[PDB]
Design an enzyme around this catalytic site. Structure first.
Site, short mmCIF file in Angstrom:
data_model
loop_
_atom_site.label_atom_id
_atom_site.label_comp_id
_atom_site.label_asym_id
_atom_site.label_seq_id
_atom_site.Cartn_x
_atom_site.Cartn_y
_atom_site.Cartn_z
N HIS A 61 0.81 -1.21 0.00
CA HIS A 61 0.00 0.00 0.00
C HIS A 61 0.84 1.26 0.00
CE1 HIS A 61 -3.23 -2.77 0.97
NE2 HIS A 61 -2.65 -3.09 2.12
N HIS A 91 5.29 6.96 6.99
CA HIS A 91 5.07 6.51 5.62
C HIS A 91 4.59 7.70 4.81
CE1 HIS A 91 1.10 6.20 7.50
NE2 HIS A 91 0.67 6.60 6.31
N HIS A 93 2.19 9.14 1.19
CA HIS A 93 1.22 9.00 0.13
C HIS A 93 1.66 9.91 -1.01
CE1 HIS A 93 -1.52 7.05 3.02
NE2 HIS A 93 -0.97 7.89 3.86
N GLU A 103 -3.06 13.67 0.83
CA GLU A 103 -4.36 13.27 1.33
C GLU A 103 -5.15 14.49 1.80
OE1 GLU A 103 -3.73 9.73 3.86
OE2 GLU A 103 -4.42 8.82 1.99
N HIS A 116 3.25 11.01 6.82
CA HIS A 116 2.55 10.74 8.06
C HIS A 116 3.50 10.09 9.06
CE1 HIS A 116 -1.56 10.65 5.80
NE2 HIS A 116 -1.12 11.87 6.04
N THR A 195 -6.42 6.86 7.54
CA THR A 195 -6.84 7.09 6.15
C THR A 195 -6.79 5.83 5.31
OG1 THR A 195 -4.68 7.75 5.20
CG2 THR A 195 -6.01 9.46 6.32
N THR A 196 -6.47 4.70 5.91
CA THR A 196 -6.54 3.40 5.29
C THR A 196 -7.40 2.49 6.15
OG1 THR A 196 -4.51 2.76 6.43
CG2 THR A 196 -4.28 3.58 4.21
ZN ZN Z 1 -0.91 7.82 5.92
#
Ligand code: ZN
Length: 257
Positions: A61, A91, A93, A103, A116, A195-196
Site C-alpha cells: 500500500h 510513511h 502518500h 491526502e 505521516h 486514512t486506510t
Molecule cells: Zn498515511
C-alpha cells in the site's frame, strides 16, 4: 483485500469497513480562512533526538519506516495532546504526477505527496490497544512540495530500489526523522481517522502548515515502487491516497493567529 484500484479502492472500502462513512473520517480539506486560532492549545513538543529506526518495508500500500517504540525514544507531546505519544512508523502518500498525491488539501490544493508520522498514546500500553480509543493516536502530517532536493529524504530514496514489491523489507538503522520536519511547527488540528482500512476514528491529526521540499527526481523514485508482489503483473505504486471526506460535526483549529 483492500487497495487503491478500481475494484478494491476508496470508493468501495465502506463495504467491508462501514466506518468509512462515519462521523470523523480523514483526510479533509483545510479551509485556511475558516480554521480559527485556538489559544487553549499548548506548545507542541517534538522529541526525536533518541529516535531508533529499524527497517523499511513495502506493505503493498505504501512503504513504512519502522521505529523502536518500546520506550519513549521519539515522542510527541503538547499542542492538542494530553500525555505522551510514541512514534511507531512513518510513511508517505503520493501521486502519479506532481499535481496530486497528498491526502489533506489546503484550500482545495493538493501537494505532490504527504508524510505521516504515526504515534500512539502510552497510557494504553500497546499500539493495538491505543487504536481502539478516540485519543489513541496522534499523526503528524507534512506536505511535500516539489522543488529543491531534500537531503533529509535521500537515505530513504536510496533504499527504495531494495523494496520494490509487496512484502520486501530492508535494514534501515540510524535514520534521523528530525530531518523530515519543517522549520516552523505551526499547525492545524482536528479529530479524525486512519486514512486506510480499518479507518478507525482514533486520530488526533496535527497537519503542519509549512511543507518540506522534494525534488522531481526524488519523488520519481517513489513511483518506481510497486503495489504487487514479486512475479505478479506490475502495478506501479502511485496515487495511494484517499480523497478528502466530509468534515461533518468537527472544527479545524489553528495553532497560529
Ligand atoms: Zn498515511
Amino acid at each position: 483485500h483492500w487497495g487503491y484500484g478500481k475494484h478494491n479502492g476508496p470508493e468501495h472500502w465502506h463495504k467491508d469497513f462501514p466506518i468509512a462513512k462515519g462521523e470523523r473520517q480523514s483526510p479533509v480539506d483545510i479551509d485556511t480562512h475558516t480554521a480559527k486560532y485556538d489559544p487553549s492549545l499548548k506548545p507542541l513538543s517534538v522529541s526525536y533526538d533518541q529516535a531508533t529506526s529499524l527497517r523499511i518495508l513495502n506493505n503493498g500500500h505504501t512503504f513504512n519506516v519502522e521505529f523502536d517504540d518500546s520506550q519513549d525514544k521519539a515522542v510527541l507531546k503538547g499542542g492538542p495532546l494530553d500525555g505522551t505519544y510514541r512514534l511507531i512508523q512513518f510513511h508517505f502518500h503520493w501521486g502519479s504526477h506532481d499535481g496530486q498525491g497528498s491526502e489533506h488539501t489546503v484550500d482545495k490544493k493538493k501537494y505532490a505527496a504527504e508524510l505521516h508520522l504515526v504515534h500512539w498514546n502510552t497510557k494504553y500500553g500497546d499500539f493495538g490497544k491505543a487504536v481502539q480509543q478516540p485519543d489513541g493516536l496522534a499523526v503528524l502530517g507534512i506536505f511535500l512540495k516539489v522543488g529543491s532536493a531534500n537531503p533529509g529524504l535521500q537515505k530513504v530514496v536510496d533504499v527504495l530500489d531494495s523494496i520494490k514489491t509487496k512484502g520486501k523489507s530492508a535494514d534501515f538503522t540510524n535514520f534521523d526523522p528530525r530531518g523530515l520536519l519543517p522549520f516552523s511547527l505551526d499547525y492545524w488540528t482536528y479529530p479524525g481517522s486512519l486514512t486506510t482500512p480499518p479507518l478507525l476514528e482514533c486520530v488526533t491529526w496535527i497537519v503542519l502548515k509549512e511543507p518540506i521540499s522534494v525534488s522531481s527526481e526524488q519523488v520519481s523514485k517513489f513511483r518506481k515502487l510497486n503495489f504487487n508482489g514479486e512475479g505478479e503483473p506490475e502495478e506501479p505504486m502511485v496515487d495511494n491516497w484517499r480523497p478528502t471526506q466530509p468534515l461533518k460535526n468537527r472544527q479545524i483549529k489553528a495553532s497560529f493567529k
